[PDB]
């Protein structure tokens, strides 16, 4: 399927353990896809303060369109020292690893796979 259902945790900055994906763009985008496909996925709200407290590069999840089933379309984005690679809609958050946080919501997406 070119698109998949996920209901990503959506977590607190301060509790996330495991702050970032990785050290290269292309590093970033990979892991994000392989934590996503495996339910290991966290999603944080951007927000004022909330990005220096995470590591670079950023891997983003953007709305792709204008939301079947309840579920936002969106695709990824990364950033690294203010150059995006990719080319998307409004930021719905942050992507990290989730390693077992507790989550303050869910966050229903159609992750353009």
Known sequence: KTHVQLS???????????????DSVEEVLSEA???LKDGTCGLVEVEKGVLPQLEQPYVFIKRSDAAPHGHVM???????????????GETLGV???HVG????????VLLRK
């Open 8 to 22: 990503l945790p959506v977590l607190q900055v301060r509790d996330v353990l495991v702050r970032g994906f990785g």
């Open 33 to 35: 896809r392989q934590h």
């Open 74 to 88: 969106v695709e990824l984005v990364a950033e690294l020292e203010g150059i995006q690679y990719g080319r998307s």
């Open 95 to 97: 992507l990290v690893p």
């Open 101 to 108: 946080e507790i989550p303050v919501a869910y966050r229903k």
